[PDB]
Design an enzyme around this catalytic site. Sequence first.
Site, PDB file in Angstrom:
ATOM      1  N   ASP A 141      30.252  60.099  52.591  1.00  0.00           N
ATOM      2  CA  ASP A 141      30.044  58.693  52.940  1.00  0.00           C
ATOM      3  C   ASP A 141      29.801  58.496  54.445  1.00  0.00           C
ATOM      4  O   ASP A 141      30.445  57.649  55.069  1.00  0.00           O
ATOM      5  CB  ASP A 141      31.182  57.790  52.402  1.00  0.00           C
ATOM      6  CG  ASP A 141      30.872  56.293  52.327  1.00  0.00           C
ATOM      7  OD1 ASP A 141      31.812  55.501  52.093  1.00  0.00           O
ATOM      8  OD2 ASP A 141      29.699  55.915  52.525  1.00  0.00           O
ATOM      9  N   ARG A 145      28.616  52.289  59.457  1.00  0.00           N
ATOM     10  CA  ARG A 145      29.809  51.490  59.122  1.00  0.00           C
ATOM     11  C   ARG A 145      31.099  52.338  59.145  1.00  0.00           C
ATOM     12  O   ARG A 145      32.190  51.780  59.283  1.00  0.00           O
ATOM     13  CB  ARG A 145      29.643  50.788  57.754  1.00  0.00           C
ATOM     14  CG  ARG A 145      29.812  51.713  56.546  1.00  0.00           C
ATOM     15  CD  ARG A 145      29.336  51.109  55.236  1.00  0.00           C
ATOM     16  NE  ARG A 145      28.285  51.934  54.637  1.00  0.00           N
ATOM     17  CZ  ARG A 145      28.504  52.935  53.791  1.00  0.00           C
ATOM     18  NH1 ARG A 145      29.740  53.228  53.403  1.00  0.00           N
ATOM     19  NH2 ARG A 145      27.489  53.642  53.314  1.00  0.00           N
ATOM     20  N   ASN A 146      30.966  53.673  58.970  1.00  0.00           N
ATOM     21  CA  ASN A 146      32.078  54.627  58.929  1.00  0.00           C
ATOM     22  C   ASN A 146      32.183  55.479  60.200  1.00  0.00           C
ATOM     23  O   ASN A 146      32.704  56.598  60.185  1.00  0.00           O
ATOM     24  CB  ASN A 146      32.009  55.482  57.659  1.00  0.00           C
ATOM     25  CG  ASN A 146      32.158  54.683  56.388  1.00  0.00           C
ATOM     26  OD1 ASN A 146      32.868  53.675  56.321  1.00  0.00           O
ATOM     27  ND2 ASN A 146      31.523  55.140  55.337  1.00  0.00           N
ATOM     28  N   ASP A 159      36.685  57.001  57.414  1.00  0.00           N
ATOM     29  CA  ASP A 159      36.601  56.654  55.993  1.00  0.00           C
ATOM     30  C   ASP A 159      36.412  57.902  55.140  1.00  0.00           C
ATOM     31  O   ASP A 159      35.291  58.265  54.784  1.00  0.00           O
ATOM     32  CB  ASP A 159      35.556  55.557  55.710  1.00  0.00           C
ATOM     33  CG  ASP A 159      35.773  54.807  54.410  1.00  0.00           C
ATOM     34  OD1 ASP A 159      35.773  55.457  53.335  1.00  0.00           O
ATOM     35  OD2 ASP A 159      35.882  53.562  54.459  1.00  0.00           O
TER      36      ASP A 159
HETATM   37  C1  4ZQ Z   1      38.272  51.151  53.992  1.00  0.00           C
HETATM   38  O1  4ZQ Z   1      39.219  51.527  55.000  1.00  0.00           O
HETATM   39  C2  4ZQ Z   1      38.703  52.123  56.203  1.00  0.00           C
HETATM   40  C3  4ZQ Z   1      38.858  51.109  57.361  1.00  0.00           C
HETATM   41  C4  4ZQ Z   1      38.527  51.781  58.703  1.00  0.00           C
HETATM   42  N1  4ZQ Z   1      39.377  52.983  58.799  1.00  0.00           N
HETATM   43  C5  4ZQ Z   1      39.866  53.359  60.050  1.00  0.00           C
HETATM   44  N2  4ZQ Z   1      40.110  54.644  60.330  1.00  0.00           N
HETATM   45  C6  4ZQ Z   1      40.580  55.022  61.519  1.00  0.00           C
HETATM   46  C7  4ZQ Z   1      40.862  54.059  62.478  1.00  0.00           C
HETATM   47  C8  4ZQ Z   1      40.615  52.712  62.161  1.00  0.00           C
HETATM   48  N3  4ZQ Z   1      40.878  51.737  63.113  1.00  0.00           N
HETATM   49  C9  4ZQ Z   1      40.222  50.518  63.328  1.00  0.00           C
HETATM   50  C10 4ZQ Z   1      39.362  49.892  62.411  1.00  0.00           C
HETATM   51  C11 4ZQ Z   1      38.791  48.648  62.738  1.00  0.00           C
HETATM   52  C12 4ZQ Z   1      39.131  48.084  63.997  1.00  0.00           C
HETATM   53  C13 4ZQ Z   1      40.013  48.761  64.842  1.00  0.00           C
HETATM   54  N4  4ZQ Z   1      40.510  49.930  64.486  1.00  0.00           N
HETATM   55  N5  4ZQ Z   1      38.478  46.907  64.104  1.00  0.00           N
HETATM   56  C14 4ZQ Z   1      37.789  46.679  63.021  1.00  0.00           C
HETATM   57  C15 4ZQ Z   1      36.939  45.437  62.811  1.00  0.00           C
HETATM   58  C16 4ZQ Z   1      37.469  44.245  63.614  1.00  0.00           C
HETATM   59  O2  4ZQ Z   1      35.594  45.722  63.204  1.00  0.00           O
HETATM   60  N6  4ZQ Z   1      37.917  47.736  62.144  1.00  0.00           N
HETATM   61  C17 4ZQ Z   1      37.251  47.808  60.816  1.00  0.00           C
HETATM   62  C18 4ZQ Z   1      36.523  49.132  60.559  1.00  0.00           C
HETATM   63  C19 4ZQ Z   1      38.226  47.499  59.673  1.00  0.00           C
HETATM   64  F1  4ZQ Z   1      38.974  46.355  59.968  1.00  0.00           F
HETATM   65  F2  4ZQ Z   1      37.477  47.244  58.517  1.00  0.00           F
HETATM   66  F3  4ZQ Z   1      39.097  48.574  59.460  1.00  0.00           F
HETATM   67  N7  4ZQ Z   1      40.158  52.409  60.942  1.00  0.00           N
HETATM   68  C20 4ZQ Z   1      39.016  54.031  57.828  1.00  0.00           C
HETATM   69  C21 4ZQ Z   1      39.436  53.461  56.475  1.00  0.00           C
HETATM   70  F4  4ZQ Z   1      40.821  53.270  56.541  1.00  0.00           F
END
Ligand code: 4ZQ
Length: 306
Positions: A141, A145-146, A159
């Site tokens: 994936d 977006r990831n 992701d």
């Molecule tokens: C479907 O779950 C995903 C969500 C994104 N994940 C992730 N992995 C490592 C670090 C992390 N931190 C992270 C993710 C963040 C973020 C700050 N830190 N700000 C946003 C928005 C405001 O732009 N996002 C997105 C991707 C969301 F809210 F959707 F997560 N986020 C990986 C998976 F957990």
Amino acid sequence: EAPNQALLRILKETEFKKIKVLGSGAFGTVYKGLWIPEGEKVKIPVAIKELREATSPKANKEILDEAYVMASVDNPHVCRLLGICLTSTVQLITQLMPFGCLLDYVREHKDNIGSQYLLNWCVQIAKGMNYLEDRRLVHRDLAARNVLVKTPQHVKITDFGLAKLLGAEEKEYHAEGGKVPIKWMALESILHRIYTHQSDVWSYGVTVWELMTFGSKPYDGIPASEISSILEKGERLPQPPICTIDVYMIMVKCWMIDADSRPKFRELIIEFSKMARDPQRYLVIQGDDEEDMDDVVDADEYLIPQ
Ligand SMILES: CO[C@H]1CCN(c2nccc(Nc3cc4c(cn3)nc([C@@H](C)O)n4[C@@H](C)C(F)(F)F)n2)C[C@H]1F
């Protein structure tokens, strides 16, 4: 095979505090938060992902499978799991990437993204991807977006919801049904459900395209059913106006029918690095936080003996 001696850290719900919601998906809610370990005198900016609200055993296996993959990675261009919280609902604790996903970042900052930045992101995604290849990991994936933005100059791959570990003499992964991103998928993945590191290379080409078009949707309007017929005919994504034949030829090479003919991630690092040394020769672009911040430490600096 080699034993996976990774350490899964279990964090107490009391150790961390939720500030606001970053994303509210159909799968769950990602929270902006702070993690204060035991009595370490540190505040780690975190992203807390909780499994929707309801506790369904089917989706708990999926979040713990994601926790397994995310705890087994350690590279500057890959997001590592800081820990899990075993509450009424399972919570993944990860490093806060203050600038969100790269796709939204390129769309929101189109008019301030230079050739040096785009090419550096390409090198960075190729480095993290080559690491996953070394770890015998197939992402399945990879998309803009990831890829999250720690700082405009530092991005990381994330992701691991579809990621699979190969090992030994296993060269390809065979999938089942489930929702899969068709527009980022290699031809063998669409026709035979075969995923390799070279299938990730195709997805890398599409990720690069998204970036170079400043967040444009690949095959915009075309339904997923037609994609397979389009790729088989020999049709590929267009040349982004900012792309020289040099950059586009790299994207094209990632989209070749023979997976072994595609570039390796270790070659994409080299190629894009040479390009990042003189970015204007390869990309043509016109004109090219409320708490006690005293003890705040980024996760990349908060380490526990490994
Ligand atoms: C479907 O779950 C995903 C969500 C994104 N994940 C992730 N992995 C490592 C670090 C992390 N931190 C992270 C993710 C963040 C973020 C700050 N830190 N700000 C946003 C928005 C405001 O732009 N996002 C997105 C991707 C969301 F809210 F959707 F997560 N986020 C990986 C998976 F957990």
